[PDB]
DNA sequence: CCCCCCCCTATCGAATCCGTCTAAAGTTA
DNA sequence: TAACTTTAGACGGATTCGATA
């Protein structure tokens, strides 16, 4: 795991400076080593000499140089993937949701995004040999659609206990964009004490549709969204967790020659499109069956799979 | 290749001055000869007389005068071009990616920038008669989307061995703009010992969108980006490698100007527009096919070509 | 042609003073006659009495008095103009590029500055009755985008010999502002022996953007630019060559008053604005067609024209 | 041949683009 | 017992420094 920030104290830094860094938002040596000088300067009690000394001391404990592709391949071969509860989706994703990156799921209503989030929140607590991540879960809720009964129903299927499954989920509700960004600092503070395997934001872009209204507020909205996504990436790199965000759709009214993937576009613009690593397009099939399509990925071919929303969570279609 | 800076000691320079120069970031005689006097002055242990003597000796060791266009033509006729793995793109570029200059590829998401980067990283190790550059590769990664399995697939396509292909790639991950600029000094130090042929930065402008937010920081952002591009150009000139960078896009919301010409504009502004030599525009086609268009070039006419992203890298569309 | 500085020996000047002046950078009687006293004083081996004697002899050898406007009209009616390869541009400029003055072309990327420079470099060698200048071309390259194949294409278009066209062009690459200024002394040295007709600097302000960074270095940058422009003007006056330089653009990010048309401004400021005699503004049209506009001139009305970039250089739009 | 002091002046020189949103409407035995 | 097409508007935003005889 990451090294606590207290190591800098014996590395040769004043305890007051470490305290100031702690209230700034940094809680590990890695978080300090990943920040630019201008971010540390903004702290009231930090001067240029203090900043460069802190950066030089932090750079010794964290490797930030060159390496080979063989070492990276060996390190990545030991990464953890979390099963989704459906064999078809697992085969489509070649194992399940990866850790250390950002995954995004978008689609129209009743397509099964909250259901997948609930199933993953339950599943991330299984032992590794059974397909789990063996950790706790964090659930930042934006719309107000969190239902623990679905968690209990999913936990019943895998033969776990309901009480300690509900004990391992942390829930928070965000009421505006400022609160949504503020919750991430407390999330970073919490992750040093225990071990977390998953962090869920649902929905990521729901409040930006209303907080910033017209074309006159577009640039500020995009800048705020970019800052939020950068913080999410920093958390994923620092703690090695899996981040799953949820998006919405918008219509195309120009009536031009676009008939593939329907006149549906995910909201957020180019910012969220470039930031995300994997994008999944969710569509409705027949009855309780849905269709999942690989929309964007650096290593996964474009394909399709079929799953269903059963009484015990997300599972294969019963035919 | 370039001359090591140790020759200045024989030319009559104190070894301590050479050590100071190496600590500053100059590892070859060419890097010293190309630097202005005010850059050498900034070093703590160098005076005006020492700078003048060093510059005089370096100029004595490097040809920096007038020549004839016939000699330039003869020298350029022996340049090395690296194939992209697609016949259509090779015909469009009249041979492939050209060393000694900066090439930029931009477009929206899943258009194929990272796939082309992986294919080039594998291909730059082929023998010259087979379309390669016969050298190692350097991959500075910004977003966290490096996947060695794609490298293994592309290597399997060409019949090479996976192990040494992975051994011949150097990987580094940048976490901020300062770290991204800092990695170039280590790259310059590395390139003296072994022969390289390609250097990928992907993405080159991803961290600038978030490190500097508003209009109040535009000037500093542009200055930092200009300095980074100048360092890249100096590396390309000194070592004769091919530099390939990757860019993103921004929307035009001003109104009903222009026409339906895909109102997407690359980011970076006039600095990156003027600095780049060749610019490639990537567009999404149908299925797995993509379209590449020549956006800017001093010797290549505007045209288009089609390629596909197959299971073994970038190649021609199978129709 | 100008009188070589060796003529002063017959006027009562020691060879020591003559070679000291030559080492200083003076190679003709006109150069000495136009220089102020303090410039001669700055030379180590020249005292005040020697400087006064040299100035008196030079003023004897060179006419520096009052004349009438009819004589000026008669001498100006014999001026030489070089065609640009396009009939409409020649009509706009009323003959072509004038010798003895400084012309500046600016615009954004792929607007056709380098193509025009290549076309002019080939064209300046045609016979006078064909629209040429009957001389050699000097090309000072700053960015590294010199391609002799375009020269070969234009020479093939005009039915010349490619070998001779390539042989009659002198090429030099500049790496910093100091080198850019230092190359002018060698240019002045070479212009004495052979008859040159064109001097191209492309780009003139590319290195000034990165060599001097912020507002703290504005004054030194502007003074260096002013000295460079003054030396260019001295060369144009002394040898009667045509001086064509290239500029870049910068965005305007405030004050939407009379600026909604085009928020593009050339760089360099009032120094280059006042120094330049004629300024041309290039725009992007449709396809391969571009638009040229008169931005500043002492004798030409403000108008517009249209040209195109073809496979054989700059020509007329094929409609 | 002898023994002690006086006083400021004058401005220069521009840079740097960003960021998408919004579905509607039945018809003809 | 089936096959059928058109439609248009909308805006705001901020900061930067050195140079002498
Ligand atoms: N216990 C259950 N058994 C079966 N299906 C259920 C159960 N609970 C919910 N569903 C299904 O969940 C579907 C809605 O999925 P979900 O709540 O994930 O929507 P969503 O994609 O998040 O939508 P929105 O954009 O409105 O938030 C419904 O169509 C319903 O059939
Ligand atoms: N093994 C594979 N087989 C087929 N297609 C693949 C494979 N791996 C990736 N792809 C394709 O690669 C595409 C994404 O391309 P790429 O990763 O180069 O995007 P990009 O241009 O770098 O985007 P971004 O701006 O998100 O970084 C996907 O659409 C996917 O279909
Ligand atoms: N052989 C050719 N045939 C047709 N067009 C060509 C040919 N070679 C180059 N071009 C055109 O030249 C254009 C670029 O022109 P040029 O190199 O003069 O640009 P520029 O304004 O000098 O740019 P920069 O600011 O980057 O230096 C491209 O848009 C390309 O279409
Ligand atoms: Ca992406
Ligand atoms: Ca360019
Ligand atoms: Ca003028
Ligand atoms: Mg939901
Ligand atoms: Mg990518
Ligand atoms: Mg050019």
Residues B178, A36: C-beta atoms closer than 8 Å: yes
Q: Where are the beta strands (DSSP E) in C161-215?
A: 169-173, 196-202
Annotated binding site of C: 107-114
The three-state secondary structure class of A201 is strand
Contact flag for A and C (3+ C-beta pairs < 8 Å): no
> B278 C-alpha vs ligand 3 centroid, how far in Å?
10
Half-sphere exposure of B159 (CA within 13 A, CB side): 3
Whose tokens are 């965005």? That residue is C251
Q: Which residues make up the environment of ion ligand 5, defined by Cβ < 5 Å? A: B 276; C 109
- Chain D bases under 7 Å from protein CB? 12-24
The A residues from 256 to 315 touching B (CB cutoff 8 Å) are: 256, 260, 269-271, 273-274, 277, 295-299, 301-302
The answer to whether C102 touches C233, Cβ cutoff 8 Å, is yes
Whose tokens are 């390669």? That residue is B132
The B residues from 147 to 186 touching C (CB cutoff 8 Å) are: none
d(CA C284, CA C288): 8
Cβ-based contacts of C167 with chain B (< 8 Å): 68-70
Closest residue to A68, CB basis, from B110, B169, B183? B169
The answer to whether B71 touches B289, Cβ cutoff 8 Å, is no
Half-sphere exposure of A174 (CA within 13 A, CB side): 25
Closest residue to A270, CB basis, from B170, B210, B248? B248
Q: What are residue B61's DSSP bridge partners? A: none
Residue closest to E8 C1′ by Cα:
A254
Q: What are residue B291's DSSP bridge partners? A: B283, B306
The answer to whether B239 touches B1, Cβ cutoff 8 Å, is yes
Cβ-based contacts of B147 with chain A (< 8 Å): 298-299
Residue C6 makes CB contacts below 8 A (sequence gap 6+) with: C18
Pairing of strands B242-246, A97-98: unpaired
Task: Starting at the earlier edge strand, list the strands of the sheet with C196-202.
Answer: B67-68, C169-173, C136-141, C196-202, C242-247, C102-106, C278-284, C289-296, C304-310, C313-315
Residue C83 makes CB contacts below 8 A (sequence gap 6+) with: C90, C95, C96, C123, C126, C131, C132
Nearest residue on chain A to B203, judged by CA atoms? A274
Q: Find out whether the beta carbon of A110 lies less than 6 Å from any atom of ligand 1.
A: yes
Alpha helices in B242-288 (DSSP H): 269-275
The three-state secondary structure class of B224 is helix
d(CA A88, CA A90): 5
Question: Around Cβ A284, how many Cβ atoms within 10 Å?
Answer: 15
**Which structural domains are found in chain A, ordered by start?**
1-73 (1.10.150.20), 74-319 (3.40.50.300)
The three-state secondary structure class of C37 is helix
Using alpha carbons, select from A108, A140, A91 the residue that is nearest to residue A245.
A140
d(CA C202, CA C195): 21
Instruction: Locate the ligand 2 atom nearest the alpha carbon of residue B117 and give its number.
Output: 18
> C116 C-alpha vs ligand 3 centroid, how far in Å?
10
Half-sphere exposure of A4 (CA within 13 A, CB side): 10
Closest residue to A270, CB basis, from B108, B211, B214? B108
Instruction: Locate the ligand 3 atom nearest the alpha carbon of residue C248 and give its number.
Output: 25
Q: State residue C128 phi and psi, 5-degree precision.
A: -60, -40
Looking at residue B4, the DSSP 8-state letter turns out to be: B
The answer to whether A278 touches A103, Cβ cutoff 8 Å, is yes
Instruction: Locate the ligand 3 atom nearest the alpha carbon of residue C111 and give its number.
Output: 21
Looking at residue C109, the DSSP 8-state letter turns out to be: T
Half-sphere exposure of C184 (CA within 13 A, CB side): 21
Residue A52 makes CB contacts below 8 A (sequence gap 6+) with: A37
Spatial distance from the CA of B220 to the C1' of D19 (Å) = 19
Nearest 5 degrees, angle CA C38-CA C42-CA C46?
A: 100
Q: How big is chain A, counted in residues?
A: 319
Using alpha carbons, list the distances in angstroms from residue C231 to B51, C25, C35, C170, C318: 25, 11, 11, 19, 41
**Helix axis angle, C15-24 relative to C48-61, nearest 10°?**
80
d(CA C173, CA B247): 28
| Protein residues with beta carbon less than 7 Å from any atom of strand E | A 214-216, 218-219, 253-255; B 214-216, 218-219, 253-256; C 214-216, 218-219, 253-254, 256
Residue A91 makes CB contacts below 8 A (sequence gap 6+) with: A305
Structure tokens at A133: 């991540």
Structure tokens at B117: 């980067």
Q: Which of B73, B268, B301 to mutate to test the interface with C (most CBs of C within 10 A)?
A: B73
> B284 C-alpha vs ligand 5 centroid, how far in Å?
24
Classify residue B91 as left (phi > 0), alpha (psi -120 to 50) or beta. alpha
The answer to whether C308 touches C317, Cβ cutoff 8 Å, is yes
The answer to whether C243 touches C105, Cβ cutoff 8 Å, is no
Q: What is the CA radius of gyration of chain C?
A: 21
- Evaluated on CA atoms B246, B251, B254, B259, the torsion sign reads positive
Structure tokens at C152: 């070969």
- Evaluated on CA atoms C139, C144, C145, C150, the torsion sign reads positive
Residue environment code for C198-225, b if the CB has 16+ CB neighbours within 10 A, otherwise e: bbbbbbbbbbbbbbbeeeeeeeebbebb
d(CA C1, CA A135): 87
């Amino acid at each position: 795991g990451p090294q606590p920030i207290s190591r800098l104290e014996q590395c040769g830094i004043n305890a007051n400076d470490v305290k100031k860094l702690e209230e700034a938002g940094f809680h590990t040596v890695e978080a300090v080593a990943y920040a630019p000088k201008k971010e540390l300067i903004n702290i009231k009690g930090i001067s240029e000499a203090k900043a460069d000394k802190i950066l030089a001391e932090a750079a010794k404990l964290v490797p930030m140089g060159f390496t080979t592709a063989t070492e990276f391949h060996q390190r990545r071969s030991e990464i953890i993937q979390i099963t989704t509860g459906s064999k078809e989706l697992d085969k489509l994703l070649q194992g399940g949701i990866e850790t250390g990156s950002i995954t995004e799921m978008f689609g129209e209503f009743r397509t099964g995004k909250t259901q997948i989030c609930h199933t993953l929140a339950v599943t991330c607590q299984l032992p590794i040999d059974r397909g789990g991540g063996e950790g706790k879960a964090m659930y930042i809720d934006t719309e107000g659609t969190f239902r623990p009964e679905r968690l209990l129903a999913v936990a019943e299927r895998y033969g776990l206990s309901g009480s300690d499954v509900l004990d391992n989920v942390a829930y928070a509700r965000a009421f505006n964009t400022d609160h949504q960004t503020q919750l991430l600092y407390q999330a970073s503070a919490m992750m040093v004490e225990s071990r977390y395997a998953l962090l869920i934001v649902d929905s990521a872009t729901a409040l930006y549709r209303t907080d910033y209204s017209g074309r006159g507020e577009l640039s500020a909205r995009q800048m705020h969204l970019a800052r939020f996504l950068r913080m999410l990436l920093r958390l994923a790199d620092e703690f090695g967790v899996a981040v799953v965000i949820t998006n919405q759709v918008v219509a195309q009214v120009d009536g031009a020659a676009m008939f593939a993937a329907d006149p549906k576009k995910p909201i957020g613009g180019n910012i969220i499109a470039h930031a995300s690593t994997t994008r999944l397009y969710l569509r409705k099939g027949r009855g309780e069956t849905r269709i999942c399509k690989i929309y964007d990925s650096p290593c996964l071919p474009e394909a399709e799979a079929m799953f269903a929303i059963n009484a015990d969570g997300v599972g294969d279609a019963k035919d």
